[PDB]
Amino acid sequence: MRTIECEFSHFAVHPGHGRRYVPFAFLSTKPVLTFSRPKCFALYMRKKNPRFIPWTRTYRRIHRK
Amino acid sequence: MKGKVLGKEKKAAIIDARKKAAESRKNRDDKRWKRVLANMDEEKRKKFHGVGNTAKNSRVRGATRASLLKRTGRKPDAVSMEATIHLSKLLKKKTFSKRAPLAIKRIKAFVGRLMKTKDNRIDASLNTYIWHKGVKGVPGRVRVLIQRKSEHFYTVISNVPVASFKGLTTKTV
Amino acid sequence: SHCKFEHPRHGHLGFLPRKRSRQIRGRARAFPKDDATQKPHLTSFMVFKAGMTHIVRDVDRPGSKVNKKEVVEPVTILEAPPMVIVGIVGYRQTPVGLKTIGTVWAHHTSVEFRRRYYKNWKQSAQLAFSRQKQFANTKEGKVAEARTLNAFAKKASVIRVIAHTQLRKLRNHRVGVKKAHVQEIQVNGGSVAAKIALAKSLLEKEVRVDSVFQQSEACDVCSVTKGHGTEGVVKRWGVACLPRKTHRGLRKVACIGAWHPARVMYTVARAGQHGYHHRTQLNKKIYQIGRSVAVEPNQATTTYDLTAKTITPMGGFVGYGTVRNDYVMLKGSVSGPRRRVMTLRRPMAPQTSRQLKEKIVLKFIDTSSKIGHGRFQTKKEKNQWFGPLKKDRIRREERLRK
RNA sequence: GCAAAGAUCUAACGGAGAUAUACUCAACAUGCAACGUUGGAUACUGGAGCGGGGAAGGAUUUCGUGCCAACGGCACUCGUA
RNA sequence: GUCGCUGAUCCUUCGAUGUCGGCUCUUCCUAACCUAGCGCGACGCUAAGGGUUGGAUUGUUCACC
RNA sequence: AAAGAUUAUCCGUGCAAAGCGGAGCGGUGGGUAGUACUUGGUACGCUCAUCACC
RNA sequence: GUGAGAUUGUGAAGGGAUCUCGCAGGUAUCGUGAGGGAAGUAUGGGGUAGUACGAGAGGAACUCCCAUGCCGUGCCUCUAGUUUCUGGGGUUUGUCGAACGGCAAGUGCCCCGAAGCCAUCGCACGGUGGUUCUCGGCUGAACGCCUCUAAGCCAGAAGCCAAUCCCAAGACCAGAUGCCCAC
RNA sequence: UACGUCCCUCUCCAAACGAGAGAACAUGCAUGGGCUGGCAUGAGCGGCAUGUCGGUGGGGCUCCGUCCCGAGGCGCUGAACCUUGAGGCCUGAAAUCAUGCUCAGGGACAC
Ligand SMILES: [K+]
Ligand SMILES: [Mg+2]
Ligand SMILES: [Mg+2]
Ligand SMILES: [Mg+2]
Ligand SMILES: [Mg+2]
Ligand SMILES: [Mg+2]
Ligand SMILES: [Mg+2]
Ligand SMILES: [Mg+2]
Ligand SMILES: [Mg+2]
Ligand SMILES: [Mg+2]
Ligand SMILES: [Mg+2]
């Protein structure tokens, strides 16, 4: 299959891992969101911004380099 | 066989027959790997990486590790060692109100197996270190100085305060 | 009075008694029927369980909504070093069953085979097979071997070989045992003379798993389940729990019999041993027969996934370690824990259904870590995510002063 | 069966209560378990207190020196014995 | 017409055999509701191997939706 | 379960007819060179070396 | 014959008789299988086919494919549950002069959390033949007509028996085999 | 008599206790290193000391500027700590595992 990126952290999700979620207020271009970890889903529920969590790709790209 | 049944000299002979004969020779005969490898097409069928004792940071193929260690006279009565004990793996999921006493018993058993003694005396500094965070808060690691003595042998075990436990190994002082 | 409402009973009465198995190895209680038309061949092999993982494949099945689509399937990995053949036995039919005629032993045996006759091999005299060894090569011993082979030829109807495992070649640190496992393997096909010829040809030699089994066939598995000790009735038999306000406990069978018969019957559930039972399991399809890593490092590389990697996951198989020999990949699960020895057997049931005849082609084999939620397939992938770390900076600043 | 009231550890001293051995044997694998006092450590009661004084009831149970047969449902070198 | 397969007594037990219904669990029967075969849309023969449910009101068994 | 001066040579054969057959070459250690096997551990050709059976 | 005892109620030593049992097995593998247990079972769809049958209306079925319900035996790759790894972090009241380190609140409380265990809340697997009943026939008389029966044969049920599957020599296996002792 | 078996001792695919599977100077055990994973950026310093660039704070004291009090913020810092124990991996593919301890094992049967 194809490898998918996690919605919150952009961790790579390989075939047979993770969990997919579809919200009621769905976006037409991304009906389904993929989560690599329960920790990532919990942060997304609490509505944190990935750019402030130091172990995410967003944070690493804006700060480290 | 029993060393009080056979003489000490007889017991020595049986050990020698196995140690130098049919074990040491096999080693010298299987040396023939050099003869075969030198003839084997270079590269070519060189897929014989491990065999021949030609490899980086590997074991001595053909003999055990214990058969190569240096043997020495028995250690003297008075001897001093320094060691680290990993108490965390010994006290996992133990009932909370029993952790410090059980730690005392485990330390005694560890030192007793090491030094072949039944009389292991805990110094005040070590007892205080083991108890200094209450009955449930025993530290994960401890560093001990062990001194053996003869009056009947016994040990005195005491604490060695350290700043970090990283990189330290068992020493004889 | 009849019961008000009805349900099926709990548990299968054909698996009684629920007692501990007599031995730890799986032994085949029967072998597939002998068809004299075929070429002589062996019918089983011994392997060791090392963890499981999962794969991806496309499905070839007309009429199914999953036709030509990718599915994920879990698999079990079993390590299979070659076996060694040490003896030949024969059996004759009698009105009371099969009887052993004799045994032909090989001229030389291994130390690992001979260790199986002792409890303390190192501190012993180590004299097993010494008299047989010296007698078998004189003039009379040769005559006796000829005699027993002729008795096999005249009177035998079943031929089996004695084989044993090679733990020194297994090279595993958590399998503590050093004495070999021994078993009889029946020779099927041909006539009695052809069977004897094959068994005599492969004496004192070793046999690989790929010479007994092929990639896309199926097999039966004989093994012993995991033990759980003394278990209560709710877990052992699956009966229902009682209501909360029940005096004297809830995890019981309420009524264990009627007034008549004035007895407890063998059909009622009671507390006792659960687990450590022998089982024979039927149709396990072979997905891959893998070569040794020393010979071919790219064990888990497929045609569609060109990444170079071995069958061992990052961090090793939990509680087992590295797979270093030949191995087999089976679809699904098998009874027993990691590190236990099991027997593969050629199948008994008909193999004519579409699912059993299908040809299998793997597309992806998972090698992420089984500790935690593994998200990298290789160490190189992990090193691409994290750049250089502080430990690496220290290593590269203290390995350059020299 | 002796499971409510959270819990003890360590050294020295004391004591018949030990470090108690036939050959062989350096020490482990052939004397275990348990106690009083002092010092140190760790906890508990938590002022409606396992604090300090009285009435009713009890009557020497109070103090010192000894002793350890019986009694203190385990133990004692200790005791309201 | 024909021919077959609740009561009444007081034998045991008053120096005591724990009295309704439900829950749980096992087993047996056939006078066959379903599943399996036959003969004639319904009716009959063989067959007890496997199965035969969730709820409202009522302490109810029954009954009724 | 085996068949024979009353169960007191060996295979072959049908409880036959015939046909064989009866220093050597085994277990162990020492050199010596190539091979086979999953490749450290076993076999195999020469060669002495102590025990052997007959 | 050969060894060891004892001869058991009033002292200490000597030698006689009888009695008793010891005089051959031990230890370690691979198998056989009498007997006993015993299990798989339902529903839907496809196509067969809008075909056969029918004035029309309407409207079948077997081989063979694909799923699902229940039941059974396991397993832990994934997803979900569980934490006294008191793992890492956060946070309240008290407390060691402060910081550091912590500690008390019988696990203070909150989040995340490996390994292990575990769910029709996840995943895997669930075999073959003989006979014979109701019944359908064939040859065939009694009763030279006739008749599936009187002899005799053939097909035939989710029944019964066996096998596959589980236990297995008080079923006392001169079944085979490694080593030591005895003869 | 001998071959051997059991206890003590060590390991955990077994386990209420027996019984089982193993080992019996062995990378066996211990400690350390590396991996794999968990949490989420340690203590201390200083905003000029970190990696030819980039360097706080609502407010408030003192004698213009300068020196101080201040929750939180930034840098060193994907830091620090933990990682086998009822019992994860590596000393035998490749590219990377090191040291330390054992110094006649003891007892009972076999008899
Ligand atoms: K008791
Ligand atoms: Mg277990
Ligand atoms: Mg009640
Ligand atoms: Mg895991
Ligand atoms: Mg008690
Ligand atoms: Mg209590
Ligand atoms: Mg308090
Ligand atoms: Mg008392
Ligand atoms: Mg039977
Ligand atoms: Mg306190
Ligand atoms: Mg606390």
Chains that touch A (3 or more CB pairs under 8 A): C
**Whose C1' is closest to the CA of B8: which nucleotide?**
H104
Q: How far is the CA of C62 from the C1' of D55 (A)?
A: 103
Strand G close to C272 by CB, under 7 A? no
Distance B55 CA to F39 C1' (A): 14
Closest to C165 in 3D by CA, of C347, C340, C291, C346: C340
Beta-bridged to residue B143, according to DSSP, are: B84
Rounded to an integer, what distance in angstroms lies between the CA atom of residue C252 and that of residue B19? 63
CB proximity list for C265: less than 8 A, separation 6 or greater: C257
DSSP class of residue A50 equals G
Q: How would DSSP label each residue in chain B?
A: --TTTS-HHHHHHHHHHHHHSSSHHHHHHHTTHHHHHHHSPSSSS----STTT-STT---TTS-SGGGSPP-PPPPSSEEEEEEEE-TTTSSS--GGGHHHHHHHHHHHHHHHHHT-S-EEE-HHHHHHHHTT-SS---SEEEEEEEEEE--EEEEEEE---S--TT---EE-
Which phi and psi (to 5°) does residue C209 adopt?
A: -65, -30
Known binding residue C263? Answer is yes
The helices-and-strands tally (H runs, E runs) of chain A is: 2, 4
The answer to whether residues C277 and C21 touch, using CB atoms and an 8 Å cutoff, is yes
- Using CA atoms of B97, B100, B101, B105 in order, give the dihedral in degrees to the nearest 10: 140
Which residue is nearest nucleotide E50, judged by alpha carbon to C1' distance?
C8
**CA quadruple C319, C321, C326, C330: dihedral, nearest 10:** 40
What tokens were used for C313? 């996951």
Closest CA to C227 of C342, C75, C340, C318: C340
Which nucleotides of strand F are protein-proximal, with an atom < 7 A from a CB?
1, 10-12, 25-31, 33-35, 37-43, 52-53
Chains near C with 3+ CB pairs less than 8 A apart are A, B
Residue C223 contacts residue C333 (beta carbons within 8 Å): no
User: Alpha-carbon torsion C386, C391, C393, C395, what sign?
Assistant: negative
* Cα C290 from Cα B105, distance rounded (Å): 50
Interface membership of C389 toward A (CB under 8 Å): no
Q: What are phi and psi of C244, to 5 degrees?
A: -65, -40
CB pairs under 8 A between B and C: 4
- C161 strand-pairing partners: C88, C185
DSSP 8-state code for residue C38? S
Distance CA C159, CA C191 (A): 10
A38: number of Cβ within 10 Å: 10
Q: How far is it, in rounded angstroms, from Cα C222 to Cα C76?
A: 15
Q: CA angle at residue B157 from B153 to B159, to 5 degrees?
A: 165
Give CA separation, C239 vs C19, C253, C263, C352, in Å: 19, 7, 21, 38
DSSP structure class, residue C180: P
CA at C402, C1' at H78: how many angstroms apart?
Answer: 29
Alpha-carbon gap, residue A44 to A48, rounded angstroms: 6
Residue window 84-143, chain B: list those with CB within 8 Å of chain C: none
Method of determination used here: cryo-EM
Residues of chain B (141-170) having a beta carbon less than 7 angstroms from strand D: 151-154
Please tell me whether any atom of strand G lies within 7 Å of the Cβ of C105: yes
DSSP letter for each residue of C322-368: ---S-EEEEES--SS-TT-EEEEE---S---SHHHH----EEEE--S
SS3 call for C162: strand
Q: Buried b / exposed e across B138-165, counting CB within 10 Å, b at 16+?
A: beeebbbbbbbbeeeeebbbbbeeeeee
How many helices (DSSP H) and strands (DSSP E) are in chain C? 9, 15
Cβ-contact C235, C274 below 8 angstroms: yes
Asked if residue B101 keeps its beta carbon closer than 7 A to nucleic acid strand D, the reply is: yes
Cβ B117 to strand D below 7 Å: yes
The torsion of the CA quartet B100, B104, B106, B112, rounded to 10 degrees, works out to: 170
CA distance A13 to chain C (A): 7
- The token pair at B124 is 């005040």
